[PDB]
Amino acid sequence: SNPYQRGPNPTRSALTADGPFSVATYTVSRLSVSGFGGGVIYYPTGTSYTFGGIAMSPGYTADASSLAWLGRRLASHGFVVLVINTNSRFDGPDSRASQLSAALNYLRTSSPSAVRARLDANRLAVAGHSMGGGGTLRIAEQNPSLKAAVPLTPWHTDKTFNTSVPVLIVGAEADTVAPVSQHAIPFYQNLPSTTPKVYVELCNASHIAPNSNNAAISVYTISWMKLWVDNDTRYRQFLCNVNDPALCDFRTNNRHC
Ligand SMILES: [Cl-]
């Protein structure tokens, strides 16, 4: 049962470190692509399986290197992950959405044969930090064929996204760049009632929590991607009946349980 199932039965511990798949990397040069600034693809190797794909945007003034740990973490659990660079480090959230859109098309159509061999392009998702997280919300509204969206400490001036794509938002309690009261929480609350949604708030965390190895971000991001991109109900346990001392808030409409 479940053709998209990959990897062993998960434990919490295992989701806080790199997973069972060997990871290859491919550098997408800036000038090689139109529509975004290149980036790095992290993808499984030493395996004959295909996997869902994820495009991920860094935040305002940041490089793809700021999410390298997470691109590799996700790939090692069984995903093809393209972390983009943006045309300009100064690009806003809606520009980042357009670039995510270009990056997804690139992954499907134009990426190296070794990457395409590992990709099931029928199953794609998005994630992003800060302004990249605002871009993640925007693209989830523009393209409801996506399987999931994970905005990390998101920032956007638009607060309402009418998307049917399942969304998990990570807020940071002590974020002064994108305060959760103005950004993450409004975004959560304003998503449709009928859309599966989760909000987790990291205790004592700042806006840069996403930029280094973070156990909570790892567990929640892997679990949401597995649940929605792979239909992998083994990951429900991490997202349901949650009692996590790393969290200082948790909200859900419990559609995923
Ligand atoms: Cl380019």
Residue numbers in the entry: 2 to 258
Provide the authors' own sentences about this structure as they appear in the paper:
Enzymatic degradation of PET using suitable hydrolases, like the leaf branch compost cutinase (LCC) variant ICCG, offers potential for PET recycling under relatively mild reaction conditions. Computer-aided enzyme engineering performed by Tournier et al. introduced an Ile at LCC position F243 to enhance the enzyme’s catalytic activity by further expanding the substrate-binding site. Additionally, thermostability was increased to 94 °C by disulfide bond formation between D238C and S283C in combination with mutation Y127G.
Out of seven mutated surface positions (L32, L50, S111, S194, A206, S207, and I209) for introducing an aromatic π-π interaction (Tyr, Trp, Phe), IMAC-purified ICCG mutant L50Y (named ICCGY subsequently), successfully crystallized in µL batch experiments with the established HTP conditions tested (0.8 M succinic acid at pH 7.0; 1.0 M succinic acid, 1% (w/v) PEG 2000, 0.1 M HEPES at pH 7.0). In addition to the successful implementation of batch crystallization for ICCGY, the nucleation window for this mutant is broadened to varying concentrations of succinic acid and PEG 2000, as depicted in Figure 2. However, the purity and homogeneity of ICCGY variants after one-step purification via IMAC were sufficient for HTP screening and successful batch crystallization, eliminating the need for SEC as a second purification step. The change in the crystal system of ICCG(Y) from I222 to P41212 is associated with a denser-packed ICCGY crystal structure, resulting in smaller crystal channels. Although a π-π interaction between L50Y and Y107 was intended, the analysis of the crystal structure of mutant ICCGY indicated an interaction with neighboring R7 (cation-π interaction). Nevertheless, ICCGY was used for crystal contact engineering studies to increase crystallizability, as this mutant crystallized reproducibly in batch crystallization experiments. Nevertheless, this study managed to not only generate singular LCC ICCG crystals for crystallographic purposes but also to implement a reliable experimental setup for reproducibly crystallizing ICCG mutant L50Y (ICCGY) variants, which is essential for applications in downstream processing.
